[PDB]
């Protein structure tokens, strides 16, 4: 009985990390085997290049960095497939969607080109998109100092996210991330319990193919 | 008057590195501004991951390593465009073709998927393919100990190379690499002088688009 692959995507400060963490804790408290993953995963060789780039300690050509973000997901595929096959549900804090939306926000990057490297990755059974008015998201304190942490770039990534959501091959679920942390959690949790109960029914798919 | 982008591809031990070196020396002796590049370029962060992988000091998931080889070319695009625009012809010892042929030789890698990351790179004005009977190429001493240095894998990369050569958007030129080092050089050199003289006539193209 395989585990489910559940991804959280969403506007900046939309609550992806808080909800990913709470979701795993709640699933495990309700007797599921669930573990948390995030992207980028900064602990590998690739991830350390990505962390330095996001912190602006290094500059990386735009196509190269896009490919490194994708490679960073592929290096985890063997582990993802193994965990799911063993019945462990995986909750993932950002995935290929963020990859495509962020590079796709830069000038002269087509969505098609941005998606290709991630074609074939493990297909999520559930993709939650935490929706929040960009302005309320900036009221969630203030912008950090990493790359992309500005208003104009975020609006352009949001547009790309909306294009990806026309992709009917994927089980997208909109979440109203403007509610309290606990109210948002309870929405996410019920949609996740549903997905887990149906993921044991059809094999793990392949993304964008 | 832009420089030309000339790539050498070819079967193992076909003579790509020797000819790349001789070609640059001859072009410069004949008053051209020409410089040598190679892929993978093992001096960058990415290139050191690639060198360790090829030497088998490290194992890398197959999709991730394919993307790293491509990223390794994109990190050099800014320099490639700048050099060509300044009138410097660039002689390149392996390029995206080797990227696609080598991963494309592994099971379950489609040529389409393998080409995507390199879509958009600077399009070579001339692609020389050094042809040699795989057996005569093994008579060029013996196999080293790096990855892919075996007979069965080389035949499968050669097949992929032949599929890429049906790509009429590219100026492929077959070279008979079984002749002497000097005879092969003289063939390559004349085809290169021709390409350089025509590359000042149309803008640098984009690969596979
Ligand atoms: N529903 C919520 N209401 C109010 N504040 C929240 C809510 N969810 C999270 N926060 C706070 O807002 C900040 C961002 O939350 P976080 O879960 O880190 O978002 P995130 O989407 O992962 N951000 P990022 O990784 O920067 O895109 C943190 O201080 C959270 O405590
Ligand atoms: N035309 C030739 N005839 C005979 N030996 C040659 C010829 N060209 C190169 N060699 C020798 O064959 C070996 C391989 O040459 P090299 O130029 O390094 O090939 P290469 O294609 O770059 N190999 P690789 O990088 O391993 O695919 C070297 O010892 C060369 O001196
Ligand atoms: C997964 C992924 C992410 N991104 C961006 C989103 C914001 C930043 C991470 O920020 P956090 O580490 O704070 O989640 O990195 C990309 O540009 N491409 C990708 O493939
Ligand atoms: C450019 C490139 C190369 N290759 C392989 C060809 C043989 C080895 C390099 O060997 P040499 O360093 O000895 O040329 O690396 C890939 O697998 N993908 C690529 O994108
Ligand atoms: Mg977060
Ligand atoms: Mg060589
Ligand atoms: Mg396509």
Curated annotation (Swiss-Prot), chains A, B:
Listed result of changing residue 125 to N: In CONPM; loss of catalytic activity in patient fibroblasts
Assigned keywords, A-Z: Acetylation, ATP-binding, Disease variant, Intellectual disability, Kinase, Neurodegeneration, Nucleotide biosynthesis, Nucleotide-binding, Transferase
Disulfides per UniProt: none
Stretch list, region LID: 130-154
PROSITE patterns xrefs: THYMIDYLATE_KINASE
EC number: 2.7.4.9
A Pfam family recorded for this sequence: Thymidylate_kin
InterPro entries found in the cross-reference section: P-loop_NTPase (IPR027417), Thymidylate_kin-like_dom (IPR039430), Thymidylate_kin_CS (IPR018095), Thymidylate_kinase (IPR018094)
Disease: Neurodegeneration, childhood-onset, with progressive microcephaly: An autosomal recessive disorder characterized by global developmental delay apparent from infancy. Most severely affected individuals have severe and progressive microcephaly, early-onset seizures, lack of visual tracking, and almost no developmental milestones, resulting in early death. Less severely affected individuals have a small head circumference and severely impaired intellectual development with poor speech and motor delay.
Similarity remark: Belongs to the thymidylate kinase family.
Protein name: Thymidylate kinase
Organism listed in the record: Homo sapiens (Human)
């Amino acid at each position: 009985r395989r585990g489910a692959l559940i991804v959280l995507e969403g506007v900046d400060r939309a609550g992806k990390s808080t909800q990913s963490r709470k979701l795993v804790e709640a699933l495990c408290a309700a007797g599921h085997r669930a573990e948390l993953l995030r992207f980028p995963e900064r602990s590998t060789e690739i991830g350390k290049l990505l962390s330095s780039y996001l912190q602006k300690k290094s500059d990386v050509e735009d196509h190269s960095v896009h490919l490194l973000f994708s490679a960073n997901r592929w290096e985890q595929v063997p582990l993802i497939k193994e965990k799911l096959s063993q019945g462990v549900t995986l909750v993932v804090d950002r995935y290929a969607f963020s990859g495509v939306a962020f590079t796709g926000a830069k000038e002269n990057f087509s969505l098609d080109w941005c998606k290709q490297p991630d074609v074939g990755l493990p297909k999520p059974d559930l993709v939650l998109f935490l929706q929040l008015q960009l302005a309320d998201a900036a009221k969630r304190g203030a912008f950090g100092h990493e790359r992309y942490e500005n208003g104009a770039f975020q609006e352009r990534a949001l547009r790309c996210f909306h294009q990806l959501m026309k992709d009917t091959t994927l089980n997208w679920k909109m979440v109203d991330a403007s509610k309290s942390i606990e109210a948002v959690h309870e929405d996410i949790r019920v949609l996740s319990e549903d997905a887990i109960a149906t993921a044991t029914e059809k094999p793990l798919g392949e993304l964008w193919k």
